[PDB]
């Protein structure tokens, strides 16, 4: 089974680095 | 060829054996134009070194193998790594490949002069339609493999 | 592999239709039995013009010259100059370009050089006032034929510039099921290297034939003299009957030979105009092939055009047969419900053609 | 047992053709996606997407 | 079969492209190039603007 | 031997140059 | 549905490798298909016919 | 009913009813081959460029 990864699941996209 | 505004997707792997766990949709795009020719070009930079300096004027070596080349490239735009612009003034008869150049400002011996150039590139005419239904397994179609 | 045709019949049409369809064709047995077999010089020049305005096209002319293999490329257009051989006038080469001009990657900007009139081919005024309006009806908003210099036969020397700014995906669907009411008659009587008297006598000649009519008659007198007047003496007229209501035009034209009477030619052309309007229903005979072809290459819809039982002659039949051979489209004709006249409605389904060459 | 398209009556003037896309083939997923008017995306709730 | 023939020519071409892809690039595609690296008078025949 | 190679190289260069013109 | 109309006599004399003639039945979709033969179509995973 | 000649034999022998057979018409431009200029981007969820 090919489960979706974290990038897929949350779909945070391109965001700036935040402290 | 296809009409403009025809969308498409791209995939690198279609066989189940090489599927792995990563996403298989590799590229997305829209067709913009149809043509029988195209003029892609790559940057080719010729490199030389100075060996004799007279203020703005300078003599350079290793840029060209013979005076044959210098005559073709007389008056070309050149610049050093430091950013000082210069010119291909004339070809020295002796030795072969050496030429005189004049620069906006005096260059140092350590500097490297580079001639920027653009070399044409050609599109490879490779066409391998996928014919999975014609195969026994219908799910292990393999074509030209990736460079890695 | 190749759709095959016989003889020099409809050479320009078959080539042009091949361009629009994108289907390769073969034309064979071109003047096989003639003493001088094979293509004529102007036909070869026409093929050169096609090559100039296309890209990816491959054309073969046989060793004997009697067979042609044509594989269309894409219409690309551009800016170019074409030298027209004296065997034909400029209108011979301009006419096929009108078919292909609106459907290019770049605008057509072609400078034609040579004789500007003849007894057998479309004149400058025929194109400007007789065919180009039909294109404007089909959606070609911007198209112009500029007469830089007039060249009469036999030495010619005329120069004309064809510019078609309008680039459109495909012609609009026609719905013309009525007989246009023509509002006025206009025309141009032109002459070169000769006295102004001939033009006036000519306009006088046409006026007598048309004086009995109930509409305005105003013919322009365009006398050409000097450097721009060409190398030979010549004179001709084009009369156009215009219907402002729906922008339709019916025209007749012809040129005069040495020793001919200017009044007689004006009378003859006037009579010929009265002939065309009698035979026409929505478009003239000389405009019909352009109208039919553009409909075939319209969107996949049914376009309707009213045509008289006079237009269905030999030329009409061969035109439809060639269209079917290349495009597989069949023109259907039905009677009109009226009893006053015996016109028929030509219903054509478009092929869904689209100008893919243009960049977006 | 079902193989290939199956056409069925769904109403007085409506019909449906059902096609089971091979789950293991990507090439199918492309061309059914080209001709599928409706897509029923089966999702295992326990496992997730 | 005709398809088998086509697959044979395709395999030949794929082998050729394999070797080309692995093969070291020509001098014109190596970015920086000096006189020694390239063949003598190579620029004369090549069209560089 | 070397001079012959240089002669051939000059010939090839002239041929390409002629092809340009 | 898919059906091969090739005469089995041809299959035995020339062999199985011979190219076949096939009949495919189904409901048309989208724009009307022209009635005249010779129309160019593409079957996914097979080619253009 | 559509009848096609000169089909590869592998299609007839290697026929699986599960895998759909999709026939699609081609416009005149689809037949032509040549250079295609397109705007393309790496898919966001693809790991590598």
Short mmCIF file of N, CA and C in Angstrom, two decimals, chain G residues 2 4-5 16-25 28 33 40-44 46 48-49, chain H residues 1-9 11-13 15 20-27 31 33:
data_model
loop_
_atom_site.label_atom_id
_atom_site.label_comp_id
_atom_site.label_asym_id
_atom_site.label_seq_id
_atom_site.Cartn_x
_atom_site.Cartn_y
_atom_site.Cartn_z
N UNK G 2 -15.60 -6.23 -28.67
CA UNK G 2 -14.45 -6.40 -29.54
C UNK G 2 -14.59 -7.71 -30.29
N UNK G 4 -12.90 -9.94 -33.88
CA UNK G 4 -11.98 -10.05 -35.01
C UNK G 4 -12.68 -10.77 -36.16
N UNK G 5 -12.71 -10.14 -37.32
CA UNK G 5 -13.36 -10.69 -38.50
C UNK G 5 -12.41 -11.42 -39.43
N UNK G 16 -0.08 -16.81 -37.58
CA UNK G 16 -0.69 -15.88 -36.64
C UNK G 16 -0.12 -14.48 -36.79
N UNK G 17 1.12 -14.36 -37.26
CA UNK G 17 1.77 -13.05 -37.32
C UNK G 17 1.04 -12.08 -38.24
N UNK G 18 0.16 -12.58 -39.12
CA UNK G 18 -0.52 -11.70 -40.06
C UNK G 18 -1.33 -10.64 -39.32
N UNK G 19 -1.31 -9.43 -39.86
CA UNK G 19 -2.15 -8.36 -39.34
C UNK G 19 -3.62 -8.71 -39.53
N UNK G 20 -4.44 -8.22 -38.61
CA UNK G 20 -5.83 -8.64 -38.51
C UNK G 20 -6.76 -7.49 -38.88
N UNK G 21 -8.02 -7.84 -39.12
CA UNK G 21 -9.11 -6.88 -39.26
C UNK G 21 -10.08 -7.12 -38.12
N UNK G 22 -10.46 -6.05 -37.42
CA UNK G 22 -11.20 -6.14 -36.17
C UNK G 22 -12.38 -5.20 -36.22
N UNK G 23 -13.48 -5.61 -35.59
CA UNK G 23 -14.69 -4.80 -35.48
C UNK G 23 -14.92 -4.46 -34.01
N UNK G 24 -15.14 -3.17 -33.74
CA UNK G 24 -15.41 -2.67 -32.40
C UNK G 24 -16.78 -2.00 -32.43
N UNK G 25 -17.63 -2.35 -31.47
CA UNK G 25 -18.97 -1.80 -31.36
C UNK G 25 -19.06 -0.95 -30.11
N UNK G 28 -21.29 6.16 -29.63
CA UNK G 28 -20.49 7.33 -29.96
C UNK G 28 -20.75 8.44 -28.95
N UNK G 33 -19.47 11.74 -35.66
CA UNK G 33 -18.41 11.13 -36.45
C UNK G 33 -18.80 11.14 -37.92
N UNK G 40 -9.42 9.29 -39.61
CA UNK G 40 -8.28 8.97 -38.76
C UNK G 40 -8.70 9.01 -37.30
N UNK G 41 -8.43 7.92 -36.58
CA UNK G 41 -8.72 7.83 -35.16
C UNK G 41 -7.54 7.17 -34.47
N UNK G 42 -7.44 7.42 -33.16
CA UNK G 42 -6.39 6.87 -32.32
C UNK G 42 -7.02 6.02 -31.23
N UNK G 43 -6.54 4.78 -31.11
CA UNK G 43 -6.92 3.90 -30.01
C UNK G 43 -5.80 3.97 -28.98
N UNK G 44 -6.16 4.26 -27.73
CA UNK G 44 -5.16 4.36 -26.68
C UNK G 44 -4.44 3.04 -26.50
N UNK G 46 -2.63 1.45 -28.63
CA UNK G 46 -2.57 0.66 -29.86
C UNK G 46 -1.92 1.45 -30.98
N UNK G 48 -2.68 4.78 -34.19
CA UNK G 48 -3.63 5.49 -35.03
C UNK G 48 -4.00 4.65 -36.25
N UNK G 49 -5.30 4.59 -36.55
CA UNK G 49 -5.84 3.78 -37.63
C UNK G 49 -6.84 4.60 -38.44
N UNK H 1 -20.98 0.18 -35.60
CA UNK H 1 -19.96 -0.82 -35.84
C UNK H 1 -18.84 -0.17 -36.64
N UNK H 2 -17.62 -0.23 -36.13
CA UNK H 2 -16.44 0.30 -36.81
C UNK H 2 -15.48 -0.85 -37.05
N UNK H 3 -15.01 -0.97 -38.29
CA UNK H 3 -14.11 -2.04 -38.71
C UNK H 3 -12.78 -1.42 -39.10
N UNK H 4 -11.70 -1.90 -38.48
CA UNK H 4 -10.35 -1.41 -38.73
C UNK H 4 -9.50 -2.54 -39.29
N UNK H 5 -8.72 -2.22 -40.32
CA UNK H 5 -7.78 -3.15 -40.92
C UNK H 5 -6.36 -2.84 -40.47
N UNK H 6 -5.49 -3.84 -40.59
CA UNK H 6 -4.06 -3.66 -40.33
C UNK H 6 -3.80 -3.31 -38.87
N UNK H 7 -4.57 -3.91 -37.96
CA UNK H 7 -4.33 -3.74 -36.53
C UNK H 7 -3.22 -4.70 -36.12
N UNK H 8 -2.36 -4.36 -35.17
CA UNK H 8 -1.38 -5.34 -34.69
C UNK H 8 -2.08 -6.56 -34.11
N UNK H 9 -1.51 -7.73 -34.39
CA UNK H 9 -2.07 -8.97 -33.87
C UNK H 9 -1.98 -9.04 -32.36
N UNK H 11 -2.72 -6.94 -30.23
CA UNK H 11 -3.94 -6.40 -29.64
C UNK H 11 -5.02 -7.48 -29.53
N UNK H 12 -5.17 -8.29 -30.58
CA UNK H 12 -6.20 -9.33 -30.55
C UNK H 12 -5.83 -10.42 -29.55
N UNK H 13 -4.59 -10.92 -29.62
CA UNK H 13 -4.18 -11.98 -28.71
C UNK H 13 -4.10 -11.46 -27.28
N UNK H 15 -5.59 -9.35 -25.37
CA UNK H 15 -6.80 -8.60 -25.05
C UNK H 15 -7.28 -9.00 -23.67
N UNK H 20 -9.91 -0.94 -20.61
CA UNK H 20 -10.82 -0.38 -21.61
C UNK H 20 -10.12 -0.11 -22.93
N UNK H 21 -10.91 -0.06 -23.99
CA UNK H 21 -10.45 0.30 -25.33
C UNK H 21 -11.13 1.62 -25.69
N UNK H 22 -10.34 2.68 -25.81
CA UNK H 22 -10.84 4.03 -26.02
C UNK H 22 -10.45 4.47 -27.42
N UNK H 23 -11.45 4.80 -28.23
CA UNK H 23 -11.23 5.31 -29.58
C UNK H 23 -11.57 6.79 -29.60
N UNK H 24 -10.67 7.60 -30.14
CA UNK H 24 -10.86 9.03 -30.19
C UNK H 24 -10.50 9.62 -31.54
N UNK H 25 -11.39 10.45 -32.08
CA UNK H 25 -11.13 11.06 -33.36
C UNK H 25 -9.96 12.03 -33.30
N UNK H 26 -9.36 12.27 -34.46
CA UNK H 26 -8.21 13.15 -34.58
C UNK H 26 -8.53 14.27 -35.55
N UNK H 27 -8.17 15.49 -35.19
CA UNK H 27 -8.29 16.63 -36.08
C UNK H 27 -7.07 16.69 -36.99
N UNK H 31 -2.61 14.90 -36.68
CA UNK H 31 -1.84 14.00 -37.53
C UNK H 31 -0.42 14.53 -37.71
N UNK H 33 3.25 16.03 -37.28
CA UNK H 33 4.32 15.90 -36.29
C UNK H 33 5.28 17.07 -36.43
#
